[PDB]
Amino acid sequence: SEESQAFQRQLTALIGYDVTDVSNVHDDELEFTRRGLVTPRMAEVASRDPKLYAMHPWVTSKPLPEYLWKKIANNCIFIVIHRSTTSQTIKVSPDDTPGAILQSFFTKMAKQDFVLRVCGRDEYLVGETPIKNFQWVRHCLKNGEEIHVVLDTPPDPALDEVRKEEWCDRKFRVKIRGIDIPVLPRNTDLTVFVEANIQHGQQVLCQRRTSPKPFTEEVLWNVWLEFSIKIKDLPKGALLNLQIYCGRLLYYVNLLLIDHRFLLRRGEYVLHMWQISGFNADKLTSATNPDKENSMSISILLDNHPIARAEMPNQLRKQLEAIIATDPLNPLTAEDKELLWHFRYESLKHPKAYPKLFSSVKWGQQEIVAKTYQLLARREVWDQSALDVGLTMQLLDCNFSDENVRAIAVQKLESLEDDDVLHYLLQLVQAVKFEPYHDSALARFLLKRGLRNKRIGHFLFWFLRSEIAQSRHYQQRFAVILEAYLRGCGTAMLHDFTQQVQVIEMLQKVTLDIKSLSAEKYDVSSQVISQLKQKLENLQNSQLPESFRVPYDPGLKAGALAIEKCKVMASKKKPLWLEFKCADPTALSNETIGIIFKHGDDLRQDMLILQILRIMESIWETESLDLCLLPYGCISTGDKIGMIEIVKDATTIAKIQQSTVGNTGAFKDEVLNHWLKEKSPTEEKFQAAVERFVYSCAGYCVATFVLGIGDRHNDNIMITETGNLFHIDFGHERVPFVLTPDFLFVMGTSGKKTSPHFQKFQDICVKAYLALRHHTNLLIILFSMMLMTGMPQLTSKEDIEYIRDALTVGKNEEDAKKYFLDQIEVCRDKGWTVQFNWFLHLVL
Numbered sequence: 001s002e003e004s005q006a007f008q009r010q011l012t013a014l015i016g017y018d019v020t021d022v023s024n025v026h027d028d029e030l031e032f033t034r035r036g037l038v039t040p041r042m043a044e045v046a047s048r049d050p051k052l053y054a055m056h057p058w059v060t061s062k063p064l065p066e067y068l069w070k071k072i073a074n075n076c077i078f079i080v081i082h083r084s085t086t087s088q089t090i091k092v093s094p095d096d097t098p099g100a101i102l103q104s105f106f107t108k109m110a111k112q113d114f115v116l117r118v119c120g121r122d123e124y125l126v127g128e129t130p131i132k133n134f135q136w137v138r139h140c141l142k143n144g145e146e147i148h149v150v151l152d153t154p155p156d157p158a159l160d161e162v163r164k165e166e167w168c169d170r171k172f173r174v175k176i177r178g179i180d181i182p183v184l185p186r187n188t189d190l191t192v193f194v195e196a197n198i199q200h201g202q203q204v205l206c207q208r209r210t211s212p213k214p215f216t217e218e219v220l221w222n223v224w225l226e227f228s229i230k231i232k233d234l235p236k237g238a239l240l241n242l243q244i245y246c247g248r249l250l251y252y253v254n255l256l257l258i259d260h261r262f263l264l265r266r267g268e269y270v271l272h273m274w275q276i277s278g279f280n281a282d283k284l285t286s287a288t289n290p291d292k293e294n295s296m297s298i299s300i301l302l303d304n305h306p307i308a309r310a311e312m313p314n315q316l317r318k319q320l321e322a323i324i325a326t327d328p329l330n331p332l333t334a335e336d337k338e339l340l341w342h343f344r345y346e347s348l349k350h351p352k353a354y355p356k357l358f359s360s361v362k363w364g365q366q367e368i369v370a371k372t373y374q375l376l377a378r379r380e381v382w383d384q385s386a387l388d389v390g391l392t393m394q395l396l397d398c399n400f401s402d403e404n405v406r407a408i409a410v411q412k413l414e415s416l417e418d419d420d421v422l423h424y425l426l427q428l429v430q431a432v433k434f435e436p437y438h439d440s441a442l443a444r445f446l447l448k449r450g451l452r453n454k455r456i457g458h459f460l461f462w463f464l465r466s467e468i469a470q471s472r473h474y475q476q477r478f479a480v481i482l483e484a485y486l487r488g489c490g491t492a493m494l495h496d497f498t499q500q501v502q503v504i505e506m507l508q509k510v511t512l513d514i515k516s517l518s519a520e521k522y523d524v525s526s527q528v529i530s531q532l533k534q535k536l537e538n539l540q541n542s543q544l545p546e547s548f549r550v551p552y553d554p555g556l557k558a559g560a561l562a563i564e565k566c567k568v569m570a571s572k573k574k575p576l577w578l579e580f581k582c583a584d585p586t587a588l589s590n591e592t593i594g595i596i597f598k599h600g601d602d603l604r605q606d607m608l609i610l611q612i613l614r615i616m617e618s619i620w621e622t623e624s625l626d627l628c629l630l631p632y633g634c635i636s637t638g639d640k641i642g643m644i645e646i647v648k649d650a651t652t653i654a655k656i657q658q659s660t661v662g663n664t665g666a667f668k669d670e671v672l673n674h675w676l677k678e679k680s681p682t683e684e685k686f687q688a689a690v691e692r693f694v695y696s697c698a699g700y701c702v703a704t705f706v707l708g709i710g711d712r713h714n715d716n717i718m719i720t721e722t723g724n725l726f727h728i729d730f731g732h733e734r735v736p737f738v739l740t741p742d743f744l745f746v747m748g749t750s751g752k753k754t755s756p757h758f759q760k761f762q763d764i765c766v767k768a769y770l771a772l773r774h775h776t777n778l779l780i781i782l783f784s785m786m787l788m789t790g791m792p793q794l795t796s797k798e799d800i801e802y803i804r805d806a807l808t809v810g811k812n813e814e815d816a817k818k819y820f821l822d823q824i825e826v827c828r829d830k831g832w833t834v835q836f837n838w839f840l841h842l843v844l
């Protein structure tokens, strides 16, 4: 119909890719996955509660941490309800429901359907949760702030309405006909061959190279390549991995040997390949290069149909248990593998053995695969174990291509509350890049969770859209999933989304136009500032949505530019610092929503780092630590371009240093402390400032050491007026982290002595450090996946191994404590050295 075609034009615009275009396909897996996702979409659409979906309470079952209780010395919580311009203050108990609080207000005012919504924000205190278990309430306690709330009507569930949809035993062999590219690289002519790997879980089941031959624009072989593997032994999800070396890896492509209908892949292929840049998730994709013109191809012919205990000794269990207790980057020896396999049944009793156990399977042998499947049919120990998110992520990584091993991981994710999904969501989305097939249990989990909760849905959208606009390697898969999400999120979220896209479409247009106008020369010129104001005026008239939702903070609705406060910014890239009126008349404050828009950097790395930071704060929350990190908002929108939350009342440490003298890399030990007292109206708030600085300094020193990003120049560390240190700009002699003598002086100490605030700082660092170490396995897997889904060509030992050593694996708590305090001292020894070394470097 002529409306299903319009609705699909809507979808294409939101997605930024056309899921009906079939110019870069060679089978129908993408189409098949669209039909396939209709069922789980519709199952979740129909069973979701209209009321709770529209209002999307943001809630948790975790206990209020000890540090937040201590901010309620009375078992009462002060909440403030509003109308017209009236307001009263109801004393309330933490265990009280929102329901119970209304009837202790309606009675307090009178002796009809209303809900308490947060002032300034699309966010609600509704549902059968104690008010202490709402996230907005926990945020207002953390921040020393009054819980402000209006009284008004539930939003019409009807607005969320969804549009009805109108939906043998021979060896395997491949023929390498030849390769063809129109323009030959650059250097001279070096020789070229084709390497054909049979690959499963990044494990090479078997390998065969063609003969070497001259590297011309056109090279032909006409060779069958016989593999050691039989056809009946190919596991589901095995890739034919075709690669080309000269010298030396220059090109790769992949073909799924078995397809989405379980059929062996037959016949002629001309595959357009990806070029290497100058191990990671890009190397794994079943997508072909869509640039059919510049790119290198390979031609092949497949012509090959179906298919679908007794008790241990003692020191061996010790061996088995030692292997099991060992960390996720510990290489399994052939000895070790056979041990796990032979004693698979005993191994199955330990949910932690699972990664190593399933990575001890010979996936290239059908009878053994089958035994593995019989192993898992009896997974009752697995099904009763508490969710261990780290274990689960290991099974969803690049080392497992079996649908059945991967599905028991997904099954375990099911008991994650929405709160926890939010924390892992970006890496679960990235883990879709390790699925052999487009339709997986992991894709369907994300779809369902997205659809069940607007907050999850929102972020799912932007996280998928981030990959769809930048990764040639996975945009088709991510687009099919995004469409499926969009086809059920509701007409009110589609509207909201459509506006958000329109805004960052316009603003990035402006961002790029301004980069051209002042090249590199560091001055911000008056002429180029003068165009920025013109261009923004223009969009505010007859182009820019009256109001859009802040992608990194979907509660907030931004309204109109404050053109006056906007400015092209003083860096080499030319980011737009932008400020917006809030569109909500009931906002308590009058402050602006600030957003930095910038091209030049890969913001996906920034996203990855920030999200680990959040995870890290949650870990510290499980042990009643609060490190006052400031994991600011940040979303990649396109190629080397995206948005960043502006943090209020913040300045760089560099700036604070350059105000006093503003010199050629000179530095002052005392200026940070003087800046703090200046910004604090009372000595009272100043001690609240030195406090936050001690915690926040400690948070970032630990976090940042663990992730290996601690050696930063001053320009990229900031502080709020009220004491919060935070690192910025993670987009890609030495120091383990930045504890400089100006930081040290705030702590009431000077090069090599002690103080109350520095004793505090040390011991907090130790508490926080060894708290991360309790989740060593989870952090190692996030880091690893981060490196594989987030950066260029990284090392499956070397780069990954950094975090093992940094988390000082396999050490008792006293060695660790020691190691980390030794790092606190390397920073003291060195002082200004590295910081000064940068200005030495700009001439170097």
Ligand SMILES: CC(C)n1nc(-c2cccc(O)c2)c2c(N)ncnc21
Residues within 6 Å of the ligand: 575, 596, 598, 632, 644, 645, 646, 647, 648, 650, 651, 652, 728, 729
């Ligand atoms: C202007 C100052 C140096 N600054 N840089 C910021 C950046 C942080 C992260 C990446 C950037 O490109 C810039 C920043 C912020 N997010 N909030 C407040 N102030 C900020």
